[PDB]
Design a protein around this nucleic acid. Structure first.
Ligand SMILES: [Mg+2]
Ligand SMILES: [Mg+2]
Length: 828
DNA sequence: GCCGTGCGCATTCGCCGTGTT
DNA sequence: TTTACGTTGCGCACGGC
RNA sequence: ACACGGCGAA
């Protein structure tokens, strides 16, 4: 903790926590590096052990160093073969069919995809591959033109959507069948390929230096191999599989080096900037209140919940797990193919959803028994707080259920009450006033005690929404029964804001209309903006049901389209995403994809949607009802969004003198400071090396031709589409930080379970976390005009030169912010 | 400079393992 | 060396009036 | 900075 104690790690740790743990920490931090390095190797090996080195980061810096030098030979060759007054070296014509440097990549990316694939490879081998590779790309690739504007025809849906070595060529080979423009292709036989490759390989040794020698055999040079290899070693040690700490995290006292104690070559950064320049920007920023939050949060002690671990260890192995959606051990034995071949899709998810489950579970068992564990914390560039280790209090239900707070306290009267509210919430009974939630729990007393007594026999808990967190609650609840209000409880009891995006919008705009929808006002009943939008959608569907157009040709009209959804079960869930993203910039076309993928696509997979006859239409239709319904509800917000977008737009713009063509104001990055003093710099940038996508072999970049470069170029588009969510998210993250500091400094709360818009503590402190999250909400927006502050941030610094078509600050509303203090259902 | 025919882009952020049968 | 189909609407770009 | 599957999240 001492600014001086930021010396030799082991000494400071032991001095504070004893040599034993001091060792465990460092041993642990070191293991994370080791594990990370392994994970890299395994991959980097399976990469070359399957001819695909060029892809790996390790070879990228080599490729870029040579890829360009090829034209300095390839083309330097053509404009030289043209000097000969006779026949052309055969290769000439059999390489002019595609982009030069595109060949060079297909060349190198293949000369190595063999020099690292097999152990005994010669010129015939390479050439028979290079030339072989020059084709395909020459074939299915020369279709770049005389097909453009029609290639992106999405007739291939994300073209080679399903990745695959030969797959990209499989589900795209007989697809070549279609006559389309012209047609027919005279295969390069099987005697030109070698020749094609031979010159490639020769003008490779002629340009680069890779392929060296003393029929012969090809071998990667000594310095170009020891390079990719060095690059690896010097790359495997930077993606550690960070793990929790067995001692409190190293407090942050600067933009880097907090969290973990071992002082390494690559310490941890406070903000997750992509560029050192971004990070370096915080290098001197005064933000005491921000460091305070991150430190307070990360000093929260957690322990593994031995009982939840107990059931989770076994039950996740059960052939048929009683837990709703837990990835099962094995597959589903062969997918007719028909529409029931989606398995390749569903099992893909399962196997990956399963990987993390076993990792989370292994971490839990690895850390059971420890008196406590901690999670270092840092932030993304908007300032939201994230635990650094893969396993953390912000994970899924099972993860959250495996974790509980280490420092509990006698639960008490209030603690018990909130514990019951939490349990009701974990069960899903949460869109109802508190009295009805308590009743839910009390009138389920025996069920809860049962699941507590014998979880693997009384699995009523697995049936709930947050089964493991609910089970976690049953144990604690059963505990209160066996011991009374004196029971020491440390269960993190979660309070979550209801649609915080809109809440923040309503607060900063004082919008009472919106506020009401998102419980920013005291109310007997619990407002649910998604359910609201859902009702409106139903009035529509109901209306379109009896009288709303019919089918033409084949295209399902309304009425029949509405009936389908009516047949379904349009609920708050279907409208969620869209209501939440609207004010972020999600348009009707967004909704379509959302409804499609979020509720239709999946419903179909399990077979509970055998009444949609083409997800589309069903989706576009739903997307429209939601838009027209969500629009008549979220307005101030949309106004506020558009105001932000205008700001981003005018700052991203590049202003040129109407007459001289001179740049008057260079594109600018949107910048703002959150209420707790966290500065955010939004500056997306259009890629530097305009990459060329060569189907099959993959994609690669290249140093620009035009000497532009300079900074990198701001992405005016991204800058405008992100400003709304980035702004609001930084606003919630600030509220999160302010609440952590407030609850700690005003109520002495030490334990926090923070999940962005979710605030948690032990039952005994629940009541105070409850007022605190509300108090900070009010102090903030009653003390700051974030939009007007934002404006004072760009109005001057970067602007004018004609730019003054800046819409006016949205009109404030009549929402009395202090009412939030008396709102039962606001939570956040 | 001022309105058509075209093209591009769908909200944003975190992070991981696989690249097949 | 045997899963994979598919639409719907605002600014930014030329650029001939 | 482009890919697929996941999850977290607004
Ligand atoms: Mg929420
Ligand atoms: Mg969420």
């Amino acid at each position: 903790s001492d600014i001086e104690l930021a010396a030799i790690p082991f000494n400071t740790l032991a001095d504070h926590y004893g040599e034993r743990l001091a060792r465990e920490q460092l041993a642990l931090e070191h293991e994370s590096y080791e594990m990370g390095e392994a994970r890299f190797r395994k991959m980097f090996e399976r990469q070359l052990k399957a001819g695909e080195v060029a892809d790996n980061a390790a070879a990228k810096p080599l490729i870029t160093t040579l890829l360009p030098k090829m034209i300095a030979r390839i083309n330097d060759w053509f404009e030289e073969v043209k000097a000969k007054r006779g026949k052309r070296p055969t290769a000439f014509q059999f390489l002019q069919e595609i982009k030069p440097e595109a060949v060079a990549y297909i060349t190198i990316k293949t000369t190595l995809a063999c020099l690292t694939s097999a152990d005994n490879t010669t010129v015939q081998a390479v050439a028979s591959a290079i030339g072989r590779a020059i084709e395909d790309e020459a074939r299915f690739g020369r279709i770049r033109d005389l097909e453009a504007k029609h290639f992106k025809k999405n007739v291939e849906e994300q073209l080679n959507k399903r990745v695959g070595h030969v797959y990209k060529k499989a589900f795209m080979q007989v697809v070549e069948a279609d006559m389309l423009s012209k047609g027919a292709w005279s295969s390069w036989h099987k005697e030109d390929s070698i020749h094609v490759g031979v010159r490639c390989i020769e003008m490779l040794i002629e340009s680069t230096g890779m392929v060296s020698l003393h029929s012969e055999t090809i071998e990667l040079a000594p310095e170009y191999a020891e390079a990719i290899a060095t690059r690896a070693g010097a790359l495997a040690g930077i993606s550690p599989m960070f793990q929790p700490c067995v001692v409190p995290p190293k407090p942050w006292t600067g933009i880097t080096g907090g969290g973990y104690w071992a002082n390494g070559r690559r310490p941890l950064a406070l903000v997750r900037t992509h560029s050192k320049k971004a990070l370096m920007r915080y290098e001197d920023v005064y933000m005491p209140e921000v460091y305070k939050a991150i430190n307070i949060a990360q000093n929260t002690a957690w322990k593994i919940n031995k009982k939840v671990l107990a059931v989770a260890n076994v039950i996740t192995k059960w052939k048929h797990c009683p837990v709703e959606d837990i990835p099962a051990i094995e597959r589903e034995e062969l997918p007719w193919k028909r529409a029931a071949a989606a398995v390749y899709r569903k099992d893909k998810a399962r196997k990956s959803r399963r990987i993390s489950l076993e990792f989370m579970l292994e971490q839990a068992n690895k850390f059971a028994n420890h008196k406590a564990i901690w999670f270092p914390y840092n932030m993304d560039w908007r300032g939201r707080v994230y635990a650094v280790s893969m396993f953390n209090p912000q994970g899924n239900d099972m993860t959250k259920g495996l974790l509980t707070l280490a420092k509990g306290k006698p639960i008490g009267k209030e603690g018990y009450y909130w514990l019951k509210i939490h349990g009701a919430n974990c069960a899903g009974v949460d869109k109802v006033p508190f009295p009805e939630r308590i009743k839910f729990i009390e009138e389920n007393h025996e069920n809860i005690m049962a699941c507590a007594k014998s979880p693997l026999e009384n699995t009523w808990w697995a049936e709930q929404d947050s089964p493991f967190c609910f089970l976690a609650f049953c144990f604690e609840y059963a505990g209160v029964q066996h011991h009374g209000l004196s029971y020491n409880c440390s269960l993190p009891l979660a309070f979550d804001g209801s649609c915080s995006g809109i809440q923040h919008f309503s607060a900063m705009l004082r919008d009472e209309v919106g506020g009401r929808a998102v419980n920013l006002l005291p109310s007997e009943t619990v407002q649910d903006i998604y359910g609201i939008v859902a009702k409106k959608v139903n009035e529509i569907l109901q209306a379109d049901a009896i009288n709303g157009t019919d089918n033409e040709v084949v295209k399902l009209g309304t009425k029949a389209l509405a009936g389908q959804w009516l047949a379904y079960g349009v609920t708050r869930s279907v409208t969620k995403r869209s209501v939440m993203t609207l004010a972020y910039g999600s348009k009707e076309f967004g909704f379509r994809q959302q409804v499609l993928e979020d509720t239709i696509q999946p419903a179909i997979d399990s077979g509970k949607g055998l009444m949609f006859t083409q997800p589309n239409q069903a989706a576009g239709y739903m997307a429209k009802l939601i838009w027209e319904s969500v629009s008549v509800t979220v307005v101030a917000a949309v106004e506020a969004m558009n105001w932000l977008k205008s700001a981003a737009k005018l700052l991203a713009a590049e202003v040129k003198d109407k007459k001289t063509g001179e740049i008057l104001r260079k594109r600018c990055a949107v910048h703002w400071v959150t209420p707790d003093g966290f500065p955010v710099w939004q500056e997306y940038k259009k890629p530097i090396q305009t990459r060329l996508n060569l189907m099959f072999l993959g994609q690669f970049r290249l140093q620009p031709t035009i000497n532009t470069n300079k900074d990198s170029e701001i992405d005016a588009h991204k800058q405008e589409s992100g400003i709304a969510p980035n702004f609001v998210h930084s606003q919630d993250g600030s509220h999160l930080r302010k609440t952590v500091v407030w609850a700690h400094e005003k109520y002495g709360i030490e334990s926090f379970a923070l999940i962005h818009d979710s605030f948690g503590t032990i039952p005994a402190d629940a009541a105070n976390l409850f007022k605190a999250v509300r108090e900070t909400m009010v102090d903030t927006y009653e003390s700051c005009d974030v939009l007007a502050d934002f404006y004072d941030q760009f109005a001057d610094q970067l602007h004018e030169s004609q730019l003054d078509k800046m819409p006016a600050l949205p009109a404030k509303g009549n929402l009395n912010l202090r009412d939030i203090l008396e709102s039962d259902f606001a939570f956040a």
